[PDB]
Each structure stands twice: as structure tokens, then as C-alpha cells.
């Protein structure tokens, strides 16, 4: 078909004799052949633009400061992981028992062992290392 010669970034305009028109503003086509162009992804509110929409590729979003992406293709934002928690693929979960995270946006390290021949001056929690 003549539509199979319209390159990515145009559509095959059925309204004007199967000609290759440019994609209209805020739209794109990633493959050749298409009878229409898909709408450009919008990045607003909590979203921000990581990659601009082009005639040939959709825009990619990231999150504003204070938040981080979640899901495939940054489907939603989530507030930065607090003191006791840690960032996983499926959200900020609590640190597991025997581990702690002291800072915000941090990663859980295992409690220090007081095996070292010392006494537990202060117990270990989800937020705080053991004290010796």
C-alpha cells in the first residue's frame, strides 16, 4: 500500500488521497505506515519533562524535587523515602529487622554486632544503629 511508504513522524492522510502529512503538533508516530499519530505524553503537576516529545518519539516524564518515579515508564511519583524506610521497585518499604537506615532517601545497612566482645549500650531500631 502507499501508506507503507510514509515514514515515522508522518501519518498516511486518508482524507487527502493517502498522502504523507506531517504529524500535527503534540503528536508523534514511532513507526512508518500509521494512519494516525498518537498524542504526546504530557508531564504536568508532579510530573516534569525528562525527554521532550518529538515527531518520532513520545515524551518521557520524571518527578519534581521531593518525589521519585515509580512503575514502568514513571507511572506515578512517590514522596522521598523517610528515615526508617528504603526505596524498592514497589515503593518505600520499611527496613527489615536487623537493619536500619539513618538518613532520608537512604539505604538499609545491617546492625553492628556488639561478636565484637562489647555490651549493648543502646538497642537497634529501624531508624538507628545499635550503640556500643
Amino acid at each position: 500500500d502507499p501508506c507503507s511508504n510514509c515514514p515515522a513522524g508522518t501519518f498516511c492522510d486518508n482524507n487527502r488521497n493517502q498522502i504523507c502529512s506531517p504529524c500535527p503538533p503534540n503528536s508523534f508516530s514511532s513507526a512508518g505506515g500509521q494512519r494516525t499519530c498518537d498524542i504526546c505524553r504530557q508531564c504536568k503537576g508532579v510530573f516534569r519533562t525528562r525527554k521532550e516529545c518529538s515527531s518520532t518519539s513520545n515524551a518521557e516524564c520524571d518527578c519534581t524535587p521531593g518525589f521519585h518515579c515509580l512503575g514502568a515508564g514513571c507511572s506515578m511519583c512517590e514522596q522521598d523515602c523517610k528515615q526508617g524506610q528504603e526505596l524498592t521497585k514497589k515503593g518505600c518499604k520499611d527496613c527489615c529487622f536487623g537493619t536500619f537506615n539513618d538518613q532520608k532517601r537512604g539505604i538499609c545497612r545491617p546492625w553492628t554486632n556488639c561478636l565484637d566482645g562489647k555490651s549493648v549500650l543502646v538497642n537497634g531500631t529501624k531508624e538507628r544503629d545499635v550503640v556500643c
Binding site: 492522510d13 503528536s27 494516525t36 498524542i39 505524553r41 504530557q42 504536568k44 503537576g45 518525589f67 514522596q79
Partner: protein, 148 residues
């Protein structure tokens, strides 16, 4: 034939009238026969008078985790006022949880529409962290086709 479908431009939840993609090179969008879109007043303009099946679709997506609740409404308004002082009206409740991150609405009916009848859609939101929810793009749709 005699039909049209429009896709809402809006993503954020702001009280006010919806803007619409009206170019038929866009996917999900059609305008055929005596049907046209006023970009300025944000209105769908019907040329020939008749009975139409008119529908609209509304989809929401949670965009901030563990946050956002409340209610969102669409309201179709005719101009000139065909009868008194909302021809079609749809409310979708935003869930408060374990993974309900979306919310769907569909409504349809037969409407008698006059020559030059202008159709516009007002979005209303019961604001409860209206930054935590957004319109799902390419999914808030107004459509109609002629039955007569």
C-alpha cells in the same frame, strides 16, 4: 457519515471548561459531515439538527502514591439553552488502600440537537489533594453520531 469524537487535552484537575484535540490526524479523534470545533469557546458545533447518541468517557489515574481522594464530575452544557436554566452528567469517585489507582466513568444517551447547537464540557472536582490525581490522557472522550 455524521459523527465526531474528541479527546480532552486537559491533564490536571482544574474546575472549568475542557479543551479538546480536534484534528483528525490524531488517534482517537474524528470529525465528519457538518460537525466542527470552535477552538476559542471550546465548543463542538453541530451543523444539521437531529437525534444523536452522545457519550462521554472519563478516566483518572493516581499520580502520587498513597494520596488523594474525593470526587470528579463532567457536565455537558448546550448552547443555546435548549431547555431551561446539564444534558449529560457523569461523576466518578476517586478511591481513598490496596492498589485502586484508576477510576472509570462512561455515560451515554440520545439527545435532540438543533442546527448550530454548541456542546461544551465543564469539569468539576471535589478538591482533596487534586495534585495526587490526574486525567488519563487519550481516555477522556466526548463522542456522538447521528441516529436520525
Amino acid at each position: 457519515g455524521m459523527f465526531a469524537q474528541l479527546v480532552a487535552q486537559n491533564v490536571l484537575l482544574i474546575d472549568g471548561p475542557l479543551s479538546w484535540y480536534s484534528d483528525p490526524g490524531l488517534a482517537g479523534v474524528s470529525l465528519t459531515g457538518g460537525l466542527s470545533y470552535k477552538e476559542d469557546t471550546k465548543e463542538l458545533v453541530v451543523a444539521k439538527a437531529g437525534v444523536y447518541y452522545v457519550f462521554f468517557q472519563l478516566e483518572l489515574r493516581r499520580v502520587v502514591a498513597g494520596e488523594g481522594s474525593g470526587s470528579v464530575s463532567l457536565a455537558l452544557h448546550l448552547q443555546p439553552l435548549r431547555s431551561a436554566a446539564a444534558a449529560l452528567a457523569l461523576t466518578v469517585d476517586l478511591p481513598p488502600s490496596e492498589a485502586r489507582n484508576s477510576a472509570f466513568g462512561f455515560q451515554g444517551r440520545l439527545l435532540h440537537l438543533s442546527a448550530g447547537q454548541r456542546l461544551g464540557v465543564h469539569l468539576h472536582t471535589e478538591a482533596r489533594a487534586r495534585h495526587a490525581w490526574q486525567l488519563t490522557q487519550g481516555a477522556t472522550v466526548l463522542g456522538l453520531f447521528r441516529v436520525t
